């Protein structure tokens, strides 16, 4: 459960290390962003030599959540951190490499490229 | 519209053929005996009256025993009426006929009616979902009270203020019957049906679906 003013680690190689959630897209007055949700985020920490800079307003997708998320078959998946991957308007990563596992929810949300790039999908 | 009287047993878990989980509430749609026919020419409305539950013959008072004897069936604990639409619909029931669980079929949509749990004297926060006032920043003993009540200097009728909550008849619509176990007279209804375990419920074919 990620909401406004929440901080997420970046699971990409875009040079951003940490982003702050600004909005949860997907309907007015929407509250929480789970795995597979797109958020508007601002970069708080960045690699000194990276392509992105601090204070950039970007669009990211949540790939891990600390709060366990139910699945259709009654099983649950839970990670140890909230992580996001910066994307462009066409739902492709702005980076070239994804770090750490991701959830299966990225398949039904049509994030095929992120799924393919990920080391493992759970 | 079919109907039957039952009892809420509890809720459990089952899996359908796509391996998804279905949380199902178990309802004991026990045997019901038709006790009276309401006809337009006699009562002004068409309806059928069903009896359910098992009770000792020494517990029924004389008026009830007389009514059951006039019907021609042995007494039961609970009695309720099913309101049909027209005489053509009520022609298919006759007194003494027994209804069991198989009147419903798998995948059917049903309307369960029961009495909600009691919650006692409840505040506006719980009875009506009022947002509270601040817990700090100077708020003085108003952490849960409604606040304003709002020319004529009169509290208009319908004020959503605190009071007794619960214990009302509730209908849940468009519940799917996952399975109709004919051996035990048990309906497996996907979803949560009103009331506590062991309460009386009425299962009717959905009016919408």
């Amino acid at each position: 459960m990620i909401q406004q003013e929440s901080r997420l680690k970046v699971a990409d190689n875009t040079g951003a290390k940490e982003i702050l959630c600004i909005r949860v897209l997907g309907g007015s007055s929407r509250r929480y962003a789970g795995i597979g949700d797109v958020i508007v985020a601002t970069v708080k920490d960045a690699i000194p030599g990276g392509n992105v800079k601090r204070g950039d307003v970007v669009k990211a997708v949540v790939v891990r959540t600390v709060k366990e998320r139910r699945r259709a078959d009654g099983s649950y998946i839970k990670f140890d951190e909230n992580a996001a991957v910066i994307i462009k308007n066409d739902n492709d990563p702005r980076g070239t490499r994804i770090f750490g596992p991701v959830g299966r929810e990225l398949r039904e949300k049509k994030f095929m490229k992120i799924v393919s790039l990920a080391p493992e999908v759970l | 519209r079919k109907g039957i009287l039952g009892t809420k047993l509890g809720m459990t878990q089952v899996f359908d053929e796509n391996n998804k989980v279905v949380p199902v509430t178990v309802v004991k749609a026990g045997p019901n005996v038709v006790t009276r026919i309401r006809t337009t020419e006699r009562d002004g409305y068409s309806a059928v009256q069903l009896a359910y539950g098992e009770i000792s013959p020494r517990k029924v008072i004389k008026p009830v025993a007389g009514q059951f004897a006039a019907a021609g069936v042995n007494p039961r604990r609970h009695v309720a009426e099913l309101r049909l639409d027209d005489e053509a619909a009520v022609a298919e029931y006759e007194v003494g006929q027994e209804l069991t669980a198989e009147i419903f079929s798998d995948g059917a949509y049903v309307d369960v009616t029961g009495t909600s749990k009691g919650k006692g004297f409840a505040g506006t926060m719980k009875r009506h979902g009022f947002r509270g006032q601040g817990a700090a920043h100077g708020a003085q003993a108003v952490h849960r009270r409604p606040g304003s009540i709002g020319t004529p200097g009169r509290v208009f009728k319908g004020t959503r203020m605190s009071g007794r909550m619960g214990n009302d008849r509730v209908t849940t619509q468009n519940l799917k019957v996952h399975k109709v176990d004919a051996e035990n007279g048990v309906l497996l209804i996907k979803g949560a049906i009103p009331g506590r375990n062991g309460g009386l419920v009425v299962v009717r074919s959905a009016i919408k679906r």
């Binding site: 649950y76 596992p101 | 899996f15 391996n19």
Partner: protein, 111 residues
């Protein structure tokens, strides 16, 4: 347990005996574009909340520097088979303290 007659119909046998602490690999069938494959989840059983049909167990694993926890119903048909590798020696019924331990400190004694 009044609902037992309902329960036993869907109850699933052949389930191996295991306790919190053992290391198991769970063979989980998944859907990948409408075809079948079995994805193996190997980790430590950190809890088991008895419920009969609603029995659940939790397997925790460390993968690529991030811990992952997965909760499965014990009698879920989505699990084709469970295999227990080793038996662990623990003093608790629920191993929640393992969520704060990494590597050397996160090891489990062997029975």
């Amino acid at each position: 347990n009044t609902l037992d007659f309902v329960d036993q119909a869907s109850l699933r046998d052949d389930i191996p005996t295991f306790s919190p602490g053992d290391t198991v690999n769970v063979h989980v069938k998944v859907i990948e574009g409408s075809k079948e494959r079995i994805q193996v989840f190997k980790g430590v059983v950190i809890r088991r909340q008895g419920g009969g049909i609603s029995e659940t167990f939790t397997v925790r694993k460390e993968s690529y520097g991030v811990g992952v926890e997965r909760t499965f119903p014990v009698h879920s048909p989505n699990i084709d088979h469970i295999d227990v590798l080793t038996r662990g020696d623990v003093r608790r019924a629920k191993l929640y303290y393992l969520r704060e331990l990494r590597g050397k400190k996160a090891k489990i004694k062997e029975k």
